[PDB]
Enzyme design. Structure first.
Site, PDB file in Angstrom:
ATOM      1  N   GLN A   1      21.068  -9.740 -21.046  1.00 47.77           N
ATOM      2  CA  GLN A   1      20.701 -10.345 -19.759  1.00 47.77           C
ATOM      3  C   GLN A   1      20.495  -9.287 -18.683  1.00 47.77           C
ATOM      4  O   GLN A   1      19.684  -9.483 -17.766  1.00 47.77           O
ATOM      5  CB  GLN A   1      21.758 -11.344 -19.263  1.00 47.77           C
ATOM      6  CG  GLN A   1      22.036 -12.573 -20.140  1.00 47.77           C
ATOM      7  CD  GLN A   1      20.780 -13.221 -20.659  1.00 47.77           C
ATOM      8  OE1 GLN A   1      19.871 -13.570 -19.887  1.00 47.77           O
ATOM      9  NE2 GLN A   1      20.708 -13.377 -21.985  1.00 47.77           N
TER      10      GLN A   1
ATOM     11  N   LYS B   1      17.864 -27.818 -25.156  1.00 51.81           N
ATOM     12  CA  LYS B   1      18.149 -26.465 -25.595  1.00 51.81           C
ATOM     13  C   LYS B   1      19.476 -26.454 -26.331  1.00 51.81           C
ATOM     14  O   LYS B   1      20.475 -26.996 -25.844  1.00 51.81           O
ATOM     15  CB  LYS B   1      18.183 -25.458 -24.445  1.00 51.81           C
ATOM     16  CG  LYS B   1      18.371 -24.032 -24.979  1.00 51.81           C
ATOM     17  CD  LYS B   1      18.003 -22.965 -23.948  1.00 51.81           C
ATOM     18  CE  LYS B   1      19.243 -22.396 -23.273  1.00 51.81           C
ATOM     19  NZ  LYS B   1      18.842 -21.394 -22.248  1.00 51.81           N
TER      20      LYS B   1
HETATM   21  N1  LIG Z   1      24.035 -18.020 -16.217  1.00 48.59           N
HETATM   22  C1  LIG Z   1      23.106 -18.211 -17.181  1.00 48.59           C
HETATM   23  O1  LIG Z   1      22.142 -18.946 -17.014  1.00 48.59           O
HETATM   24  C2  LIG Z   1      23.234 -17.459 -18.470  1.00 48.59           C
HETATM   25  C3  LIG Z   1      22.173 -17.395 -19.386  1.00 48.59           C
HETATM   26  C4  LIG Z   1      22.339 -16.647 -20.557  1.00 48.59           C
HETATM   27  C5  LIG Z   1      23.559 -15.996 -20.787  1.00 48.59           C
HETATM   28  N2  LIG Z   1      24.571 -16.096 -19.899  1.00 48.59           N
HETATM   29  C6  LIG Z   1      25.846 -15.422 -20.123  1.00 48.59           C
HETATM   30  O2  LIG Z   1      25.751 -14.062 -19.703  1.00 48.59           O
HETATM   31  C7  LIG Z   1      26.725 -13.274 -20.385  1.00 48.59           C
HETATM   32  C8  LIG Z   1      26.063 -12.029 -20.975  1.00 48.59           C
HETATM   33  O3  LIG Z   1      25.129 -12.398 -21.992  1.00 48.59           O
HETATM   34  P1  LIG Z   1      24.277 -11.284 -22.793  1.00 48.59           P
HETATM   35  O4  LIG Z   1      23.235 -12.022 -23.590  1.00 48.59           O
HETATM   36  O5  LIG Z   1      23.876 -10.206 -21.813  1.00 48.59           O
HETATM   37  O6  LIG Z   1      25.373 -10.711 -23.809  1.00 48.59           O
HETATM   38  P2  LIG Z   1      25.311  -9.245 -24.467  1.00 48.59           P
HETATM   39  O7  LIG Z   1      26.338  -9.265 -25.559  1.00 48.59           O
HETATM   40  O8  LIG Z   1      23.877  -8.867 -24.739  1.00 48.59           O
HETATM   41  O9  LIG Z   1      25.832  -8.282 -23.296  1.00 48.59           O
HETATM   42  C9  LIG Z   1      27.150  -8.417 -22.787  1.00 48.59           C
HETATM   43  C10 LIG Z   1      27.628  -7.021 -22.416  1.00 48.59           C
HETATM   44  O10 LIG Z   1      28.789  -7.090 -21.578  1.00 48.59           O
HETATM   45  C11 LIG Z   1      29.657  -6.039 -21.983  1.00 48.59           C
HETATM   46  N3  LIG Z   1      31.027  -6.313 -21.510  1.00 48.59           N
HETATM   47  C12 LIG Z   1      31.989  -7.047 -22.097  1.00 48.59           C
HETATM   48  N4  LIG Z   1      33.110  -7.058 -21.327  1.00 48.59           N
HETATM   49  C13 LIG Z   1      32.854  -6.305 -20.236  1.00 48.59           C
HETATM   50  C14 LIG Z   1      33.585  -5.881 -19.027  1.00 48.59           C
HETATM   51  N5  LIG Z   1      34.855  -6.273 -18.805  1.00 48.59           N
HETATM   52  N6  LIG Z   1      32.934  -5.104 -18.149  1.00 48.59           N
HETATM   53  C15 LIG Z   1      31.668  -4.686 -18.332  1.00 48.59           C
HETATM   54  N7  LIG Z   1      30.941  -5.023 -19.403  1.00 48.59           N
HETATM   55  C16 LIG Z   1      31.479  -5.817 -20.364  1.00 48.59           C
HETATM   56  C17 LIG Z   1      29.491  -5.931 -23.488  1.00 48.59           C
HETATM   57  O11 LIG Z   1      29.881  -4.630 -23.932  1.00 48.59           O
HETATM   58  C18 LIG Z   1      27.999  -6.192 -23.647  1.00 48.59           C
HETATM   59  O12 LIG Z   1      27.269  -4.957 -23.603  1.00 48.59           O
HETATM   60  C19 LIG Z   1      27.307 -14.192 -21.443  1.00 48.59           C
HETATM   61  O13 LIG Z   1      28.495 -14.753 -20.881  1.00 48.59           O
HETATM   62  C20 LIG Z   1      26.284 -15.303 -21.572  1.00 48.59           C
HETATM   63  O14 LIG Z   1      26.874 -16.490 -22.098  1.00 48.59           O
HETATM   64  C21 LIG Z   1      24.423 -16.791 -18.759  1.00 48.59           C
HETATM   65  N1  LIG Z   2      26.687 -19.805 -22.674  1.00 53.33           N
HETATM   66  C1  LIG Z   2      25.374 -19.263 -22.831  1.00 53.33           C
HETATM   67  C2  LIG Z   2      24.321 -20.277 -22.425  1.00 53.33           C
HETATM   68  C3  LIG Z   2      23.941 -20.077 -20.968  1.00 53.33           C
HETATM   69  N2  LIG Z   2      25.053 -20.396 -20.118  1.00 53.33           N
HETATM   70  C4  LIG Z   2      22.706 -20.907 -20.654  1.00 53.33           C
HETATM   71  O1  LIG Z   2      22.623 -21.569 -19.572  1.00 53.33           O
HETATM   72  O2  LIG Z   2      21.762 -20.920 -21.505  1.00 53.33           O
END
Ligand SMILES: NC(=O)c1ccc[n+]([C@@H]2O[C@H](COP(=O)([O-])OP(=O)(O)OC[C@H]3O[C@@H](n4cnc5c(N)ncnc54)[C@H](O)[C@@H]3O)[C@@H](O)[C@H]2O)c1
Ligand SMILES: NCC[C@H](N)C(=O)O
Ligand SMILES: NC(=O)c1ccc[n+]([C@@H]2O[C@H](COP(=O)([O-])OP(=O)(O)OC[C@H]3O[C@@H](n4cnc5c(N)ncnc54)[C@H](O)[C@@H]3O)[C@@H](O)[C@H]2O)c1
Ligand SMILES: NCC[C@H](N)C(=O)O
Ligand code: NA
Ligand code: NA
Lengths: 344, 344
Positions: A149, A77
């Site tokens: 997410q 990925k």
């Molecule tokens: N753990 C995993 O497997 C995994 C998988 C995918 C994404 N992620 C991570 O999850 C996070 C969110 O991803 P996403 O696709 O939802 O992004 P996104 O941009 O769709 O949503 C993020 C949201 O968080 C908000 N935000 C920013 N700072 C904030 C704060 N202090 N308090 C509250 N809200 C706040 C933003 O306004 C935005 O609406 C990212 O860090 C991404 O890398 C993790």
């Molecule tokens: N940093 C965004 C990617 C996310 N941590 C994942 O496992 O896909």
């Protein structure tokens, strides 16, 4: 031999035909089985991912995540985190693709969208963890960050817990005001509530923010319910955290990938000897989670390539059964294997 | 926004329309300027590539090779080394693909074959180094290993040196017998010659074998001409080397990518403190290289992602001018950037 390419249309047709609920259930089930297999030492965690930091227009990262099944195939990925994407370009923050390579020859055999798949397995992973560690009668979900997410966090959790309402916050007023519409299909009523109220009232929380490095916590160190389970999902840059240290130090903390979580998860804040057993161990041997539903718990989620490989397999089973996708000769296979110029 | 895909047949059209000499010369030119830009601190070496070893049916490795041009694009080559592919499957040993992602957003913008591209830039890299480190009147090229890479080794070196003769060896008799036919377009007369004769008579040598780990050297530590330049091109697994240690220790040695060469090149046999300036520095200031033309020199070649990004640019410029390739919607861009289920 040609590469099997699943276009965005083919991925959309899989979810349309199968349905969001049933597709997410399949991924939850495959993830649960796969995690137990790792916990039993039948399989192994993916190696540490890597990435390239990007500072403009706001700090982000682009990462590669391989996972090998020896003798079968390799999954890679590639995925970007670009938190200015929604407001600047109308693109998702998380943008990626997933490829499969034959382990015997190295040939690229399959390629598909990573955007939907990522949201599905990330929601699913929280569901596996929360099933183990949230109260089975949990009724109130809290969400900090109501972006992409948060949609699949709510959806997946609503399939494994009797959720009745979601209290939600985002630092962007438009993003939190739009969440109810995006969540409507789940039938979980949505109410905007400030982080302190979410901390006080939620039975289970998911944090999934694009908060910058060093600007946590996104949930305040205050009163929480004694049985609270938190899925800490936000993860990108080294130095990015979402939870207050004081709450973390009181928590039973299980990471999906301990080495990765110590680098990029909430476990950055923790000494390595304070980690609970990893999620895979919880899935194989529930003695580790027994009783932890009634005290504070945190699932430190960073995501790892095995989860993508499993979700891709669910997609390819459905796609193969429906004969979806196209075949493209991308790799150059010269008639003479020793002649790169035999463009045959 | 769709992904631009160049098929095997588009890559063939590029070669047929541009011509082999012109295409090779464009990649040599681009690589020379790019390496000089690294030499002058205007660009940077790619990060360490990563890899997964595979043991069946014979030992090989599958690798990922990222390179970032900040603000423009990220390149990733995924490439397998599977030395049983020709005999067992009629596939090339080196099988791979090169992807391009927009650096601002992360979006996948282009995807093409990496088989031919790899052979082109690997020959071009040897041409760059040998123009710097071989006598300008070199007439005899030696080749140990006459598989895929040897074809472009001879082609590229025949464009920068006045080659009259190529003395070639391979451990497989059918592979060395077929090489003259694969090499005929270069015009350089090919002779089969055993390694000791190649060592004694060659002005320039490229070693590019699939020798197994610990089964080197492929060229004997015997009488070599005083001015001999060697391109050490074979590289896959940790522990694989091609040159005798005694020869290496007498030579001026320049790596294309020092940390990769330390792990995967001939420099595995040397102390870290014993290498010269890397190739990028010699391109920026050929003075450091002119004085090594009349002495024993080794270019330790491992390949690194920047070369793939440069050669990909050459192919995309030629493909765009001829309107080649297809456009595939692979990545899911939801109509609502915060809604992964908003499929369209
Ligand atoms: N753990 C995993 O497997 C995994 C998988 C995918 C994404 N992620 C991570 O999850 C996070 C969110 O991803 P996403 O696709 O939802 O992004 P996104 O941009 O769709 O949503 C993020 C949201 O968080 C908000 N935000 C920013 N700072 C904030 C704060 N202090 N308090 C509250 N809200 C706040 C933003 O306004 C935005 O609406 C990212 O860090 C991404 O890398 C993790
Ligand atoms: N940093 C965004 C990617 C996310 N941590 C994942 O496992 O896909
Ligand atoms: N440095 C780079 O940038 C770069 C780029 C591409 C490939 N490579 C490496 O170059 C090597 C050659 O790749 P290829 O695509 O030509 O593979 P190939 O299989 O087409 O050719 C390898 C040849 O070496 C021969 N050989 C094996 N052991 C030998 C020995 N002891 N003496 C003489 N010949 C021997 C084999 O018979 C075969 O003909 C591989 O190790 C590959 O990983 C390096
Ligand atoms: N290890 C084989 C791959 C080759 N070294 C390359 O740079 O493409
Ligand atoms: Na985390
Ligand atoms: Na080498």
């Amino acid at each position: 031999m040609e590469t099997w390419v699943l276009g965005r249309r083919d991925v959309a047709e899989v979810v349309a035909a199968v349905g969001r609920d049933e597709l997410m259930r399949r991924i939850i089930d495959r993830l649960t089985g796969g995690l137990a297999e790792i916990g039993r030492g039948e399989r192994h965690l993916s190696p540490l991912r890597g990435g390239l930091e990007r500072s403009e227009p706001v700090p982000g990262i682009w990462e590669w995540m391989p996972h090998r099944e020896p003798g079968d195939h390799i999954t890679l990925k590639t995925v970007g985190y670009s938190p200015a994407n929604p407001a600047r370009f109308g693109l998702p923050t998380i943008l990626g693709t997933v490829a499969r390579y034959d382990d015997t020859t190295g040939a690229l055999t399959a390629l598909m969208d990573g955007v939907l798949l990522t949201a599905l397995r990330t929601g699913a992973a929280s569901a596996v963890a929360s099933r183990l560690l949230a109260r089975p009668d949990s009724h109130t979900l809290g969400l900090i960050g109501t972006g992409a997410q948060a949609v699949t966090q709510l959806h997946a959790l609503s399939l494994v817990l009797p959720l009745q309402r979601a209290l939600v916050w985002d630092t962007d007023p438009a993003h939190r005001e739009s969440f109810a519409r995006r969540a409507a299909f789940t039938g979980v009523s949505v109410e905007i509530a400030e982080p302190a109220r979410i901390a006080a009232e939620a039975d289970v929380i998911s944090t999934a923010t694009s908060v910058a490095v060093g600007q946590g916590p996104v949930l305040p160190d205050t009163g929480v319910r004694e049985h609270l389970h938190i899925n800490a999902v936000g993860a990108d840059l080294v130095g990015k955290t979402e939870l207050p240290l004081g709450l973390l130090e009181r928590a039973f903390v299980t990471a999906d990938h301990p080495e990765q979580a110590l680098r990029e998860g909430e476990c950055q804040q923790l000494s390595a000897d304070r980690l609970g057993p990893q999620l895979a161990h919880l899935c194989a041997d529930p003695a580790a989670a027994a009783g932890r539903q009634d005290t504070l718990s945190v699932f430190d989620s960073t995501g790892f390539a095995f989860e993508d490989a499993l979700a891709m397999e669910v997609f390819l089973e459905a796609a193969a059964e429906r004969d979806l996708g196209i075949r493209v000769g991308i790799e150059h296979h010269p008639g003479d294997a020793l002649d790169p110029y035999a463009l045959q």
